[PDB]
Subunit: 277 residues, 4 copies
């Protein structure tokens, strides 16, 4: 209705970064993932895999202590900040990260918002998802804040009912990205990527294979890794949302859309990304 343009294959091709011969892991940065709780452990593995698949140099996972041994056998490349998401409620981050994500598998509590407030005092892009999404405002800071709500979470953030939101998705997403001064990735079919400077795009990829628990946690991870290897954080977000949907389209060529498990998106990404190089 606002004629929001699609982020197309040609855009993805023009903006995906190289991984030069002369580079080292430090070139691609260290990401911090604050995710996974004893009651919701899976989200940390889904987001960790998404992140390490997506071009970072190193990943530190600040998960609950009992979740760590569940990640190690599947993702032995990750390192840990034991109970990191809880500790981040109490102090500003001492270390420097290229990018930070918070929320997948975390409860919707005040202590999580305290961790968000401490994360936001860092100078790097920050992603807020799932339990870190709430009705709130954001401090002026250097790097972008990127909110990744599904329509239910957007309702929790804004009070726009889901049935009203879904009639004018790009219009509400743009309005609230402007108001909050955050990036908003408004999930669903034709995901809207709304920037606080008024740029806005639609994502043309993806299908109903994604309409299952865990696919959003994978995307959060993919955005986190992409923020580390793209110079322009806008291109990171756009490319992550695009390639995420493209992995689901690859799956449905020879597999039923009913049967995808989110972690498989991360297994498919290596081949899908290569096609856009």
């Amino acid at each position: 209705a606002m004629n929001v343009p699609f982020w197309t294959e040609e855009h993805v091709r023009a903006t995906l970064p190289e991984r030069d011969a002369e580079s080292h892991k430090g070139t691609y940065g260290t990401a911090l993932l604050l995710a996974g709780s004893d009651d919701m452990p899976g989200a940390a593995l889904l987001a960790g895999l998404g992140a390490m698949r997506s071009g970072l140099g190193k990943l530190v996972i600040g998960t609950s202590e009992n979740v760590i041994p569940l990640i190690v056998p599947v993702l032995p490349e990750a390192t840990y900040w034991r109970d990191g998401w809880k500790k981040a409620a109490d102090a500003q981050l001492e270390e420097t990260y290229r990018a930070i994500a918070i929320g997948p598998g975390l409860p919707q509590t005040e202590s999580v918002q305290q961790a968000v407030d401490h994360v936001l005092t860092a100078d790097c892009p920050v992603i807020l998802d799932a339990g870190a999404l709430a009705k709130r405002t954001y401090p002026k800071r250097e790097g972008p804040v990127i909110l990744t709500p599904h329509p239910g979470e957007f309702f929790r953030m804004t009070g726009v009912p889901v049935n009203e939101l879904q009639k004018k998705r790009a219009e509400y997403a743009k309005e609230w990205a402007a108001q909050l001064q955050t990036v908003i990735v408004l999930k669903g079919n034709q995901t809207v990527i709304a920037f606080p400077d008024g740029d806005c795009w639609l994502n043309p990829t993806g299908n109903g294979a994604l309409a299952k628990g865990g696919t959003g946690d994978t995307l959060t991870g993919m955005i986190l890794g992409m923020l580390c290897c793209h110079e322009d954080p806008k291109h990171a977000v756009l490319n992550a949302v695009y390639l995420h949907g493209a992995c689901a389209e690859l799956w449905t060529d020879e597999h039923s859309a009913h049967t995808l498990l989110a972690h498989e998106l991360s297994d498919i990404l290596p081949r899908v990304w290569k096609r856009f190089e």
Copy 2:
């Protein structure tokens, strides 16, 4: 002998659901799986994988606390109700599920029957398998109750000896589905699917590759997921039993029937289901 018809490829094709572009995980519902105990943990992973492979939107696994970390690395998409099957003995379910299964890897105890009684007060289809199968009757309720006995369990439910049962499988299964007012999936070669309204079918798929521990737990999961994405719960049951057997037939094209492990049925299902679309 009663000329029970086979649920054929043509029936499966005509009744398998679409997964539309405009859908979200809520369209495909949340399933609850009450399965897995410290002594029999594997059943929860087999049934969880079967369920998440089979078109649901979300899965909550109410397993014993010590079983949770065994599922997470393999199925990080699942969420948990810690000690759920035990807690369900004490109270009616507060939350609303699209479908519920109970019994795989649970002991044949009175406390399991108490959990069954509480599950049955929900308005959704309910599957009873393994430890939840007993000699008992069922309350009038809205949604179907689906019993999935092998012949030994059918003997425990009815007192019909296995050697007598196996001579007239469809006749006993129909009689008892009518008497109990439950669906009965009477397992084995040519599994019988008997509905309490007197409809009855035979399953034409499957082979001896399935004659090994865990394949029934996988099927229970597959029925649970299919109940979430089919409008007609009859078609869910029939399609689950059919596709389960078809995965074993795909396996035996290039692998010996002696060597299948149940969890591999769930890995094969994505490709097998696609063939029937």
Copy 3:
């Protein structure tokens, strides 16, 4: 030197069992595996996988309590007898098994020999490997006892030094199978399969890819499963040793012999077994 014949492809083909349409898991029996200790946990997973791959109906793994959660995510089809190998020191088996193996990953202690003595009072074939192999004699019983020593273990059982053994492998293996009234599978290149009735064969398959920790534990499992689905326990042993070696030969077609991991033998067996049907 004694012109011991090779168990050939033609023998394997003529003796491998069918898995009939009308069968159920009970047709293929329940195996018991007494393996894996806190200090040597891996052996239980290697042998469990070998066994469930090899045509049994059900597997009960009597492993140490802390080893159970290490097996479940990889082999959720197995069931458990918690601390089974330890408990078997104290009482005769109450339950009936189709076949039993003891020793992989168990210490060479008197308590393990006490468990062996209790196992031998069952009427089924029994495999003794690794920690269950000692200098001892065997009681007259119904079913075969099958010892699976490498040359070092054969030295521990008999006092024949390894350097003397390796000069006349079939002659020593036959002599001691006769003396002990046990089957002896004397491992190595050209493994000798010596029966106490004086039959003896050489195994023609296998290569240096097998010369690495864990491949023997896999074989023990494979023999256990094969004992459950072959009518003739001699053919089970021979076919297990043969197919084990054939999986290593398949591997070396496209992979270096230096790089095989034992568990991969079990992943290869499905395709290799099919070729001999």
Copy 4:
């Protein structure tokens, strides 16, 4: 600048060992890996997999107690020395190993240097990586000591700043290999392999896919295994560094360089090694 020659395909082909029909696991030795701590567990799995993939006969992993259950499901072929890296601080090794590696996932502490001092009294090649790398000297002993620093660790060992090092990598690496009387594998694009007798080579393989956490831990493991199956420990080091890089090149044929996870190097090695036979 010093015209250091490349270790080429032709060198690799001429020096990779055979795995003879008549061999047994004892022919290829037992390696000891002292790696992995509660805070950095993943390194033990990465290095263990690298080592068991690389032609050893047996592997003993001396890791922290809580790390053991994280390795077992992925690498059930490994055995353990519980808290081995800690215990090695207190006594000389009682057992004989073909080769030893220490440091991946260990803290940079004095107690780790005490374990290094005890390891060095063994007569076998010893690899020092990660936390075992420090500014220190080395005792005259029989077998080679092999240091595997990235440029940051080389700075910690020598005080040559990274920006100065990277201008004259081979010159600094040769000078310090001579001074310390250690092998130095100076990591990065065109990794330098400098021997204390003044031989020096460059590695021609590898790419930016390797510029991510965990790839060095995999290499340490690969060197450890290769030391066990090559007669000449120089050829082991060179071949390990070469094949490690070649696995990353195979990956990038059909997968994006951004998306490799280190453990996958070990999965690729079987096929890559075969190509050089």
